[PDB]
């Protein structure tokens, strides 16, 4: 039976209509991220730039990205963060296809 494929398959296509409308609202926004006493504005283009580095590695250095940006995409549950790794991951690799499929 293909029923489990296509279980998988609206599990994957979910997860790219969840991202595209993550990044859609970046359109007109430049979020705000708050780490302690800091608060730093960061830009879509930004956003963009690091989550491209997924496309071709699904464990990314956090020496890549800054921190404002990797926090903002860990607090909104795009990305895992291993603090002693000092390596990033997608939250699933539903969400590590919807990169590839969507940047």
């Given at each position: 039976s293909n029923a489990l494929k296509d279980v998988l398959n609206i599990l994957l296509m979910d997860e790219i209509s969840k991202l595209k409308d993550f990044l859609s609202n970046l359109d007109y926004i430049k979020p705000k991220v708050n780490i302690e006493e800091e608060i730093i504005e960061i830009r879509k283009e930004d956003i963009i730039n690091a989550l491209k580095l997924f496309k071709g590695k699904y464990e990314i250095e956090v020496?890549?990205?800054?921190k404002a940006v990797y926090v903002y995409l860990v607090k909104k549950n795009i990305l895992f963060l291993y603090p002693q790794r000092g390596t990033l991951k997608p939250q699933s690799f539903l969400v590590w296809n919807a990169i590839k499929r969507v940047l």
């Open positions: 020496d890549k990205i800054p």
